[PDB]
Amino acid sequence: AQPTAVRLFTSESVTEGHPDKICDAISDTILDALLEKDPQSRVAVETVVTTGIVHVVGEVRTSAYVEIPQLVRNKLIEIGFNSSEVGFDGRTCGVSVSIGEQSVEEDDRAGAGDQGLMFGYATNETEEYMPLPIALAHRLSRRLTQVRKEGIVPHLRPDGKTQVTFAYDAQDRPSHLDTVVISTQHDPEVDRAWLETQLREHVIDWVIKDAGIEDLATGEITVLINPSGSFILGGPMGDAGLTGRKIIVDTYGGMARHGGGAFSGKDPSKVDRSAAYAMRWVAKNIVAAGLADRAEVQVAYAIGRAKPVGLYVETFDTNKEGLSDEQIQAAVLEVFDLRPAAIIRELDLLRPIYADTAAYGHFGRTDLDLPWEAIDRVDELRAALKLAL
Amino acid sequence: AQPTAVRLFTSESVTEGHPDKICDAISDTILDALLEKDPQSRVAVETVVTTGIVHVVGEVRTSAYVEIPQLVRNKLIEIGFNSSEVGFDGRTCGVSVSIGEQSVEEDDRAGAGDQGLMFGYATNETEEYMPLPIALAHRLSRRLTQVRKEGIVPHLRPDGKTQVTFAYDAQDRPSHLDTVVISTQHDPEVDRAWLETQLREHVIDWVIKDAGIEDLATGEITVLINPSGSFILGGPMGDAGLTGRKIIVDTYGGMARHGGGAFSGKDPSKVDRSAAYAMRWVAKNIVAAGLADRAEVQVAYAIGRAKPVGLYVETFDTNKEGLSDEQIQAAVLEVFDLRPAAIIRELDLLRPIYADTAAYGHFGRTDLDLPWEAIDRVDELRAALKLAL
Amino acid sequence: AQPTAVRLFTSESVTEGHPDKICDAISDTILDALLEKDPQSRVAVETVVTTGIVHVVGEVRTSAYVEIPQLVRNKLIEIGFNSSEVGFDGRTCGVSVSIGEQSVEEDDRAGAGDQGLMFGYATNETEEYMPLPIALAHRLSRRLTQVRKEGIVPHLRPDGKTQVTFAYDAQDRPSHLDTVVISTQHDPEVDRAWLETQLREHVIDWVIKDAGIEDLATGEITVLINPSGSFILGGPMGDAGLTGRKIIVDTYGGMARHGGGAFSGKDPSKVDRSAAYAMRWVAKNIVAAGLADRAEVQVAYAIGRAKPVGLYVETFDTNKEGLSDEQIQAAVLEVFDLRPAAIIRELDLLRPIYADTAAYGHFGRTDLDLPWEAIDRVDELRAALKLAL
Amino acid sequence: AQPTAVRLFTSESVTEGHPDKICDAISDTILDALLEKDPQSRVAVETVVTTGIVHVVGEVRTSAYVEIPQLVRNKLIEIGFNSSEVGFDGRTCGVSVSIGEQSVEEDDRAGAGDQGLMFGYATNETEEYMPLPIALAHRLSRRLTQVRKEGIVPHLRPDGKTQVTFAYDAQDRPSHLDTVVISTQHDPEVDRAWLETQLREHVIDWVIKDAGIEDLATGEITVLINPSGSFILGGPMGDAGLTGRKIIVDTYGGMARHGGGAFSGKDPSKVDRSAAYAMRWVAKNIVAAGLADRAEVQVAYAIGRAKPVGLYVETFDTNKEGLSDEQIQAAVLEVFDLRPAAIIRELDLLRPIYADTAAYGHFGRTDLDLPWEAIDRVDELRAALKLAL
Ligand code: NA
Ligand code: NA
Ligand code: NA
Ligand code: NA
Incomplete structure (x- = not known):
């Protein structure tokens, strides 16, 4: 018919040398350098590159002392931008900084620093649980x-x-x-x-x-x-780059939905990054627990509130054990503490592990040891659902 | 159980006064000002705001003469940033420009200017076909x-x-x-x-x-x-803003998938914007033709090639008339020319209509007359599928 | 006839609120903050202001840790730029930094860091020895x-x-x-x-x-x-300011000749500043020793050489004791060590005393205690010239 | 004795490649490009260079359309900065512009746009009347x-x-x-x-x-x-440059006194430039008329007043014809109209002749045809003084 x-x-995907990824990498190199000396650093650092120029902007609250210009120049030389002949040179380019530096009990009850939605995803089609x-x-x-x-x-x-x-x-x-x-x-x-x-x-x-x-x-x-x-x-010349302009490359390539939040330049106190990591952790555990072949979970938050305003589990009809997505979601609510401070604590996020995430994806990295990739909640999920272990 | x-x-969503949307709006005000004098303007303009600063970067090829600083300052006053007391002032803030200005037959056969994937979506749950x-x-x-x-x-x-x-x-x-x-x-x-x-x-x-x-x-x-x-x-002070950092707010709020491409600051020659608009046009016509209640279409392109490398129609089991998504997709391939130059021509995209899109969504705008919102391919789709009109 | x-x-003269003097003051506030923690800081810091923007550029070699943005903002509030209503606001303006931080025996024999000429002047027409x-x-x-x-x-x-x-x-x-x-x-x-x-x-x-x-x-x-x-x-809006654009106001108001070197933003290792201070010291002592009513002395240096290539004493026919300017000059060469490292040592220049110099003149300041204003070489000059004390 | x-x-002196002179040259290239299309252009353009960066700031009122970035890049390539290997590259460096473009009868009676003092000088020791x-x-x-x-x-x-x-x-x-x-x-x-x-x-x-x-x-x-x-x-890397930081090299090398005003980036309506040119014209004519071997003339102005508040002729005892400096000054007041609009008219300053002045001196240029170098007031001065022609 x-x-x-x-x-x-x-x-x-793109290389670490694509201008958007240069920005993500520089943002996360600054964040690591600050978390290495002061694990409590609050960091909102955005990078912009264009012909001959690297402009770093945003806000830091930290007790650490880091030399941002040398961090920028060394990262550009590591990527391979070391000559006007290649279109950009870490040793001779402009570097400008416009960053403002000023102006467990209660811990786990702290409000989200912003509203927003974040998605996590996992599939058993690959060993790394990635599309x-x-x-x-x-x-x-x-x-x-x-x-x-x-x-x-x-x-x-x-x-x-x-x-x-x-x-x-x-x-x-x-x-x-x-x-x-x-x-x-x-x-x-x-x-x-x-x-x-x-x-x-x-x-x-x-x-x-x-x-x-x-x-x-x-x-x-x-x-x-x-x-x-x-x-x-190639590089910034004739192709401006900005931090947070490759959020789909950073996540699941468009297979999964996205809330719009960028990850690089943000400390773990930012739900845009922490909650997306938590959703990857939840989704991977849902699939690793045999509850589904593919799982996508959205979480949402109101500014000044610790408990999510929303949660949404979808397994695309791949649900197993005769369980609905509503039942899997109730088990997720029993097993996972999704308050921002609980996510930081359970995933141990206050460490300089972010520069490695800033090119080639935040998820399904066989080459890294990332805490949001741990399938350490499978037993808890099956128990909560009264299934055999 | x-x-x-x-x-x-x-x-x-966010107001036009959220720093990311200030950037999208300034980017698209520059693009409109150039398209008004030179409809062929090639425009890749990114905006960055932080405390007291608006930095515009990227590339323009145009025959038009526009005063970018006055466009920036007037747009900030229109949004309402007109005082240090409000945190930002269009009249007294910094404005810096780092833009490089230099260095139908064949028309419809021009290659995509970049690779990439773009998604479009439509649902009959609202009159505007929006989630x-x-x-x-x-x-x-x-x-x-x-x-x-x-x-x-x-x-x-x-x-x-x-x-x-x-x-x-x-x-x-x-x-x-x-x-x-x-x-x-x-x-x-x-x-x-x-x-x-x-x-x-x-x-x-x-x-x-x-x-x-x-x-x-x-x-x-x-x-x-x-x-x-x-x-x-509020505004840029203590919350840096960048163009293309609200791509989910600009599209379907996370209900639909996204390819990662930002729209503002880009002329219609950029598939990141034109192909996403075409996919909204295709999805809306699919639902308006009674082929489905909800439809999401992904399109993909290789740099230097006019024909998409990919197309992917999903109706989430809401498909009608006993037709599969494979059959709807074949009808889309018969009805729609998805070469970049064909999209520009059929949607008449070479006009200063973009600043209006730069806050409150690109899609389902009852208050605007946007060509990618036209349900003018319904008869063609039903005909191609040998259905009654 | x-x-x-x-x-x-x-x-x-100008107030500390004139845009050029804002730059000189910010440059010297940065220099003081660095000399306070590391008296050996090498500092070449230039400031530029325009509408809503403060841009600091140059080179620092230091072991000190200083927050340049807060130093800038606090200095602007001290001058009185605290509102968009006044045309500029230290609290809400842009601040950008583009400074590179990397890449007695021998001490007194170190070469001048640059070539150049510098003038010093003194007159007995005022108690402060100023025109x-x-x-x-x-x-x-x-x-x-x-x-x-x-x-x-x-x-x-x-x-x-x-x-x-x-x-x-x-x-x-x-x-x-x-x-x-x-x-x-x-x-x-x-x-x-x-x-x-x-x-x-x-x-x-x-x-x-x-x-x-x-x-x-x-x-x-x-x-x-x-x-x-x-x-x-007033201020930077509609009147851009730069460091070193008020060198005549900083010296003798055009009564004396000038070599072109600016003082603010430069550590005492820069002959542009140290040698000009030494020439003021020599001129004031020449007049205080009763050798002349008015005296102007030029000194010049070759890069990599400690001894001046030039020295030039002029007393405009006000010479006393039947001595020529050639004779006064020979006595200056016997009394004063004008090698850069000797000037730093004898004037004790490695201290945070410079921000006070950055408006209202470097010379004849009754309100400050500056070492180049000391008449502590009078006895040495008269002795060298075989005159009564 | x-x-x-x-x-x-x-x-x-310095080459056109010294960073301060790069700035003066870029400032005056922008001014020429504007005067070429609109001889009435009001121009206050300052340039700053540092590693990999050219930042142009200030104010323009013009009807002309000029591409500042291409003017900057072409001027840097003309000087020879064309490689990261040489330390700076006009083709790949950053270029940023922060310029605000907005917000005979009466003609000869217009007020000075600013207060200030300016000096001019001439000596017969060289054919070009230069020290x-x-x-x-x-x-x-x-x-x-x-x-x-x-x-x-x-x-x-x-x-x-x-x-x-x-x-x-x-x-x-x-x-x-x-x-x-x-x-x-x-x-x-x-x-x-x-x-x-x-x-x-x-x-x-x-x-x-x-x-x-x-x-x-x-x-x-x-x-x-x-x-x-x-x-x-060499160049900007490790040696920041700014417009108006070589005012002594631009004038008489310290032989003559200076008022502090920079010349480059300023249209002829700025007394800082026009009045200094007029003083060179007056001094050269005084010496060419045989009234002295060496002459230095200071002129001063109040903002909103056309007539100078001051004038000061010094010939350093080289005065001839038994005339005092007071008598020469009275003859200067009879011969020269030193109102700003009269200087522009008599010297025909509204032409793109300034980029050539921006390195190797504004005065005594045998290689240029500059109107302030004309000895066309000799007959008028001797006549006014009742001397033989
Ligand atoms: Na479902
Ligand atoms: Na399907
Ligand atoms: Na003399
Ligand atoms: Na005299």
């Missing part, structure tokens, strides 16, 4: 940076972007890898032709095997490398 | 600004935020208004007690009737006004 | 600020300027006060008419008596107060 | 830039400084060249040893002959080239 089209779902499209995109962006830093593929520059499109079935499940896009900055000594062969072998094919998805990468797949052509100049 | 909790879903929680939040933020500008409620200041939590049923449908939060900046002559009575009557109750949701606002509802207490100082 | 005109010589025109202008600017801060004259604002013109004789000597100009910022509650009566009595007439110049202020003198009319808005 | 020392007088020390320093700085741009001496970079010390007699007259200092930025391929031979021959010796001062350059002269050693990195 009426023709059917194949539904194609896409997620993207396949975003996971593959992050692996590709990380591998692109690795081949450059380890010299596996030479003549590469820091700025880069990755995009993965997967065909899906009528049940909303991933079926086949359809299209992979990789755009990387490079030296004038190399061209798209050289990059096409180098990246398809050392980045795309290597990641397909490293991720064990060969079964989804069989057949015909479109590979586009530098489809726009030469990419010699 | 195991206890059930009520699922509670939340969406928020109820975000629609109520936008109505509250708009009414809060209106009562101040028209003097219905005196002693109010520009900065404000609104949040609405709705109880939902097991079928993922809104059932009852549960909690409304309103936080507004104000003069020292008034306090939370005075605001509680004034806002609950002139803003919350007025909006409930104006929106015809009295049937969902019966019973017990929690109303919180300035729950954190006094809000005399 | 051919007609004679009366030669009229002019010098000016009469600049001394009167400084007294007027200080009195204008005092009447405002002590409330002697109400409704005054911080920004102000003073100018004094004196008639001179054919021997280049001051003969009579001819014209006094005072321009002050003010509240809208007062006008030029009210200021004319208030300032002429509480500022001009009071200073004439306080300085004991009634004998030069007899007869007809032109007094102009706010000759341009209203001065409600 | 008491020993005599030789009095040694010093003046300095020998500053003239030689300017010739050396210009030659240093020329050898680099024409490739006479390779491996040179833009930043450089020159200093000349001359021995003087007891009559205050130059007697012999004593010390010449040249410090130039350079490539790592060359060292001080190579520069010592190249600059002493192609710059110092060439200038001595080009200026015809071989008679003052006989005997023993100290030549110091890069006495501090290597100078690979």
